[PDB]
Each structure stands twice: as C-alpha cells, then as structure tokens.
Amino acid sequence: AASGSALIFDEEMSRYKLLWTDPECEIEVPERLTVSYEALRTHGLAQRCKAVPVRQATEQEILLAHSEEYLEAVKQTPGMNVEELMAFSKKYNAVYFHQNIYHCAKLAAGATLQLVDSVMKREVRNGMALVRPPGHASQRSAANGFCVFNNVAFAALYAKKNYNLNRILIVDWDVHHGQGIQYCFEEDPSVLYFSWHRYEHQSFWPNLPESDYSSVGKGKGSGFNINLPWNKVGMTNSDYLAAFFHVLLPVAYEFDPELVIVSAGFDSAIGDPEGEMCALPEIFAHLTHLLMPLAAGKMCVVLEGGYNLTSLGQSVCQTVHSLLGDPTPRISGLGTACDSALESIQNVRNVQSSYWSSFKHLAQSEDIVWPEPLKRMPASVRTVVVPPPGVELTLPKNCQHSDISESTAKEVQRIRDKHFHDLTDQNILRSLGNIISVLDRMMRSDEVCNGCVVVSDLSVSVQCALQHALTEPAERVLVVYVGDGELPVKTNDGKVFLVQICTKETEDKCVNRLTLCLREGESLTAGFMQALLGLILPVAYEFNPALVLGIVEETRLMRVWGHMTCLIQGLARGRMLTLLQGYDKDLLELTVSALSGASISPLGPRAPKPEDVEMMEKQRQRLQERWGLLRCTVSESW
Ligand SMILES: CC(O)(O)NCCCCNCCCN
Ligand SMILES: [K+]
Ligand SMILES: [K+]
Numbered sequence: 067a068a069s070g071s072a073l074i075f076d077e078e079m080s081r082y083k084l085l086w087t088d089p090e091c092e093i094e095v096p097e098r099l100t101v102s103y104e105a106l107r108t109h110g111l112a113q114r115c116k117a118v119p120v121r122q123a124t125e126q127e128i129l130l131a132h133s134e135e136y137l138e139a140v141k142q143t144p145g146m147n148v149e150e151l152m153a154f155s156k157k158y159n160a161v162y163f164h165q166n167i168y169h170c171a172k173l174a175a176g177a178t179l180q181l182v183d184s185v186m187k188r189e190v191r192n193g194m195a196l197v198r199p200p201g202h203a204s205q206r207s208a209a210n211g212f213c214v215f216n217n218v219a220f221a222a223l224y225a226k227k228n229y230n231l232n233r234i235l236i237v238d239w240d241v242h243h244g245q246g247i248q249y250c251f252e253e254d255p256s257v258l259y260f261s262w263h264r265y266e267h268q269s270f271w272p273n274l275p276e277s278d279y280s281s282v283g284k285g286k287g288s289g290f291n292i293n294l295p296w297n298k299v300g301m302t303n304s305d306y307l308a309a310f311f312h313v314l315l316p317v318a319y320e321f322d323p324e325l326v327i328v329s330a331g332f333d334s335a336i337g338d339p340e341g342e343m344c345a346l347p348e349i350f351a352h353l354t355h356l357l358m359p360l361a362a363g364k365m366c367v368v369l370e371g372g373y374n375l376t377s378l379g380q381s382v383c384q385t386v387h388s389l390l391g392d393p394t395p396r397i398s399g400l401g402t403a404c405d406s407a408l409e410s411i412q413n414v415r416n417v418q419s420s421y422w423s424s425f426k427h428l429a430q431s432e433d434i435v436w437p438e439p440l441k442r443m444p445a446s447v448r449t450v451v452v453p454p455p456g457v458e459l460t461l462p463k464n465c466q467h468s469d470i471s472e473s474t475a476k477e478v479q480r481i482r483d484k485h486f487h488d489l490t491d492q493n494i495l496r497s498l499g500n501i502i503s504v505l506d507r508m509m510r511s512d513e514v515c516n517g518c519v520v521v522s523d524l525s526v527s528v529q530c531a532l533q534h535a536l537t538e539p540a541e542r543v544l545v546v547y548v549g550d551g552e553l554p555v556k557t558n559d560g561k562v563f564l565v566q567i568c569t570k571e572t573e574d575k576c577v578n579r580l581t582l583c584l585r586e587g588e589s590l591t592a593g594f595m596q597a598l599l600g601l602i603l604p605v606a607y608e609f610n611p612a613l614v615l616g617i618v619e620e621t622r623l624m625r626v627w628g629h630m631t632c633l634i635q636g637l638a639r640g641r642m643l644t645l646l647q648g649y650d651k652d653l654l655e656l657t658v659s660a661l662s663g664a665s666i667s668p669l670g671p672r673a674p675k676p677e678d679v680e681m682m683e684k685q686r687q688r689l690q691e692r693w694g695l696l697r698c699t700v701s702e703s704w
C-alpha cells in the first residue's frame with residue numbers, strides 16, 4: 067500500500083573537496099551533488115519526492131562493515147591540517163581526505179540508512195539518496211577510490227539486522243567494480259551482488275584479478291557474486307540491455323530478493339571521463355524500470371560515481387522519473403551486443419551455470435555531445451478501464467472509467483459498413499467505440515497512458531484495435547497474444563511483431579513472430595518468466611513499437627501477467643492497450659493494477675521444464691540472426 071519516492075539529500079555533503087594537486091582524484095568534485103539536485107529541481111522531480119532528512123550513521127552502524135582501527139583513524143582527520151591530510155590520504159589508493167570528509171561520510175552513510183528505513187517501513191515505495199562520498203570501493207579497513215565508508219554495504223547489513231531480511235539484491239551499475247561490496251558479502255548467500263564494470267583484461271582500475279567473471283563467491287556464498295567485466299570501452303545501450311536480459315534479470319527473478327539496493331554510478335553513461343562508455347542517460351530509465359517488479363518495488367538507489375556533470379544530471383533525472391513511475395522513453399537503434407560484450411556475457415553465464423536454473427542447460431549437451439532527453443510528463447489519467455456494461459469497480463486513484471463521441475460513433479459505423487456487414491450486436495459495436503476512444507486518448511494526447519477493455523468478439527475487436535492504431539499512425543505495433551488460434555494479424559510488412567503464448571505446438575515461418583508453446587503444469591511460471599526475459603523483452607526492445615496491444619483469450623495466467631504488464635511498459639512510452647475476452651474480475655483487477663503503476667506482488671519460487679528450455683533456445687536460434695539483442699553468445703564466423 068506504500069506510495070511515493072524518497073529523495074534524500076543535504077548540501078552539507080558538498081562541503082568537502084580536494085585540497086592539493088592530484089589528477090587522479092580531481093574529477094570527484096562537490097558540484098556532482100549540486101548539479102544533480104538542481105537538475106531534479108529544474109525538471110520538477112525533487113518537488114514530487116518525499117524529502118527525508120539525512121542523519122549521521124552511528125559508531126555502532128559504521129562497525130557493521132568497518133574495523134574499529136580504521137574508524138578510529140578516520141575519526142582523527144577532522145583535526146588534521148593539509149600536510150597531515152595529504153600524508154593520511156597517501157596511505158590509500160585513489161582517495162583524498164578533508165577536514166569535513168569524516169562528517170560527510172557519516173552523513174552519506176546515514177542518508178542511506180534513512181532511505182532503507184523509509185522503504186522498509188512502507189513510508190515510501192522506493193527512493194534515491196544523493197550522497198558524497200561514494201561508498202562501493204570502501205573496504206573493512208581502508209578508504210579506496212574516493213570512498214570512505216561503504217554506504218551500500220551498510221544498507222544491506224542494516225536491513226538484514228533490523229528487518230530480518232533473508233535475500234537482498236545489490237545491483238552495481240557504476241562503471242567501476244565495487245570490490246568493497248564483493249569482499250563484504252563474498253561468503254554470504256543472503257546478499258546477491260551484481261557488478262558490471264570496465265575491466266579491459268584487468269588493465270583498468272582497480273586492476274584486480276578478482277573483479278573477473280570467475281569470481282562467483284566463496285563457500286556457501288558460491289553463485290551469489292556476479293561480475294560482468296567490460297573488456298572494451300564504448301559499450302552501448304544494446305550491451306547494457308543484453309547484460310540485463312541475459313545475465314542479471316534471470317538471476318534476480320529466481321533469487322526473488324526482499325529488497326533491491328542499487329549502487330548507482332552514472333560514470334557508466336556517455337561522456338564520462340572514467341567510463342568512456344556510450345550508453346545514453348535514457349538507458350537508466352530502463353535499468354531502473356526493469357528492476358521495479360522485484361521486491362514489490364522496494365528499491366533503494368544510492369549515488370556512487372558519475373563525473374561528467376551533464377550526463378550525471380540527465381541520468382539522475384531519468385532514474386528518478388522511473389522511480390516516480392513516469393513513462394519510460396523509447397530506445398531506438400538497439401541491436402546485437404558487440405563481440406567483446408557477448409564474450410563477457412557467455413563467459414559469466416557459463417561459470418554461473420552451476421548455480422542458477424536459467425543457465426543450467428548450458429552445463430551439459432543433451433568534447434562529447436549527445437541529444438538532450440525529451441520530457442517525460444506523467445499522463446493526467448494514467449489508465450482508462452472499460453469493464454462490461456454495468457460493472458462498477460473500485461479503481462486506483464490514477465485510473466478512470468471509459469463516453470463515446472459523435473466522431474467516434476461515425477467511425478464505428480463506417481468500419482461496420484465496410485468490413486463487418488452482418489454485425490448488429492449493439493454491444494460489440496459499443497466495445498469498438500470504446501477501443502477507438504481509448505486509443506485516440508492514448509495516441510493523440512499526453513492525457514492517457516494506457517488502457518484495458520473487456521471484449522466478447524475477439525476477431526472484430528483485434529482487427530479494429532490494430533487497424534486503427536496503424537493509421538494513427540503508429541509506425542510499429544507489438545502484439546502480445548495469450549491464446550490459441552489465428553488472429554486477424556498480418557506480420558508481412560515489418561510494422562507488426564506478434565508474440566503468441568499458446569498450448570498447441572506450431573511451426574513458425576516468419577521472423578516477425580514468436581510463438582511459445584509452454585507445457586501446462588507446475589513449471590509453467592518459471593518457463594514463462596524465462597521466455598519473457600530472454601526472448602520476449604529482447605525482441606520487443608529491438609523492435610521498438612509505438613503501441614503494445616495485449617490480447618488474452620477467454621480460454622495459469624494469474625501469477626505472471628502482472629510482471630509482463632509491468633515490464634512491457636518499458637516499450638512504447640508505456641502505451642499499452644489490453645483486450646480481455648470475457649469478464650474475469652481478478653484478471654481485470656490485476657491488469658489494471660499493473661497498468662496503473664502499482665507495486666507488483668512477488669513471484670516467490672520451480673525450475674523450468676527442460677522441454678520448455680529447448681523450445682525457447684530453438685526460438686532464439688531461429689530469431690537471433692534478425693533480432694541480435696537475443697544473442698547471449700559470440701556468433702560463429704564463417
Ligand atoms: C566511485 C568510483 O567507483 O567511480 N570511484 C572510481 C575511482 C577511480 C580511481 N582513479 C583511477 C586513476 C585514473 N587516472
Ligand atoms: K559496477
Ligand atoms: K553474496
């Protein structure tokens with residue numbers, strides 16, 4: 067029942083800085099916080115968040131992750147002059163100290179714990195902490211890489227201790243490895259750590275052998291540490307999404323965390339002098355959105371690095387936009403990950419295959435400039451619902467019921483007289499008026515985002531929805547069909563891609579459709595999730611539709627439909643129209659809940675049928691030449 071997003075920030079954390087010459091550290095500046103908060107303010111995002119004050123982490127809280135000797139050493143730095151601060155700093159790798167940095171480090175850590183408490187007490191759904199100094203390179207007894215104390219390691223240890231959590235996912239999308247987090251939880255199966263990072267075969271900072279893909283954790287932590295090293299610079303949106311679809315998300319949804327903490331370094335964005343990657347700030351809107359169906363949306367985003375002030379501001383805004391539920395921007399030009407990334411991805415999937423059900427089939431044979439991001443205003447009415455006539459339902463506050471116009475009514479009659487001569491059922495005709503009215507508000511107004519219409523006649527309804535969308539004009543339409551039979555849907559001209567979930571086995575011929583025949587049984591949920599993350603989402607993202615048309619025929623859906631409806635809203639700026647054939651109160655409630663941006667209830671835990679995995683890998687083989695985002699291995703060369 068939680069709502070809102072926390073934003074935790076205090077300008078005191080900009081009141082320490084580098085006091086001597088050091089080209090290595092001169093990029094970590096106070097303005098990183100100032101620019102990020104002001105960017106949120108400029109775009110109206112800070113004003114929509116719940117401002118939670120910072121506090122100091124206590125001594126006892128710092129000792130959750132750090133040694134008494136290191137804390138006592140850092141505690142003396144407020145009393146040091148500049149000569150003494152420089153000599154203290156030289157004891158460590160890539161870090162400077164300042165009279166006020168100990169104070170600020172305790173605020174950065176306390177801010178993080180405030181964020182954890184706000185989310186874990188259900189006072190907000192999610193939130194972000196904008197802090198300095200960053201934390202993820204901090205070690206038990208050493209400052210490292212601009213980090214004094216390990217803010218995110220605190221947050222996980224604090225959440226285990228005070229909320230008795232058994233499963234916490236940490237996602238570190240900073241462009242540097244967070245070695246301090248890895249070390250902290252190396253033997254701990256209760257904390258799953260994922261990091262991608264510029265590595266370049268160990269020649270990039272921090273130059274550690276243990277930052278490679280072979281470090282899977284130790285002891286009973288084996289399999290709960292996932293390193294994805296980037297061995298070339300210039301990684302793009304496609305490389306980052308390939309990493310999510312084929313490594314992080316399959317593991318995350320199987321792990322089923324009770325809390326997600328993001329080590330959010332935006333030095334992984336285009337323009338950054340440390341990362342030298344090419345991902346656009348818009349990608350962070352999707353990295354955030356793809357994780358929101360985990361842990362019922364309980365996500366704590368904690369600022370780490372990010373050194374190009376421009377992409378820093380833009381990427382922070384894209385993240386908070388998604389935390390607030392604003393429509394995600396369309397990502398164009400996606401395709402195959404590059405060969406270096408595909409090598410990295412296939413190596414981590416292979417070493418992790420001992421530990422995760424999604425990868426188990428692999429174990430045996432049988433001046434930089436870029437365009438400014440567009441505005442992301444939320445829709446006035448997010449979701450319009452059309453239940454059968456005379457069905458009054460209690461709707462969430464951002465949902466509304468359907469009122470057919472005069473122009474719309476004339477359109478239905480023109481359509482009737484041209485394509486459905488022998489049709490007079492005055493409520494089929496009502497549904498067609500409803501479909502056209504909802505689509506018009508979705509496509510020709512920032513007024514409505516998405517919608518759900520309950521229908522009876524599937525063929526007429528589908529044909530009217532699709533044909534009307536194609537002349538809006540919606541350049542491309544993704545159709546997602548749960549049911550058997552043939553739809554009045556042509557996939558011959560490249561403007562429609564059809565995903566069909568059915569029960570009868572079918573040979574696919576064209577590469578503009580994906581047909582998934584999943585065995586009924588206790589394994590159906592895991593197979594569907596496997597298909598959704600590894601097949602459906604890669605193709606949908608590469609296809610980049612302008613509208614998503616969901617269709618469920620009246621003829622096992624309840625557990626996965628909410629996750630699909632949430633994740634598929636990463637496409638088409640969230641513009642999804644769902645046609646439900648027949649009235650099912652629970653399915654309609656679940657659909658409306660997911661469409662409106664409500665928290666998605668967790669899946670919990672049963673590994674997929676090997677016959678389903680074989681079916682899905684045959685689909686990947688059949689489709690990945692056309693849709694390269696499906697690839698999770700390096701291609702065979704002639
Ligand atoms: C938070 C973080 O992970 O981004 N810290 C990165 C520390 C970079 C160390 N500088 C290496 C030398 C480059 N000239
Ligand atoms: K990282
Ligand atoms: K671990």
Ligand SMILES: [Zn+2]
Nearest residue numbers: 240242331371
């Ligand atoms: Zn970094």
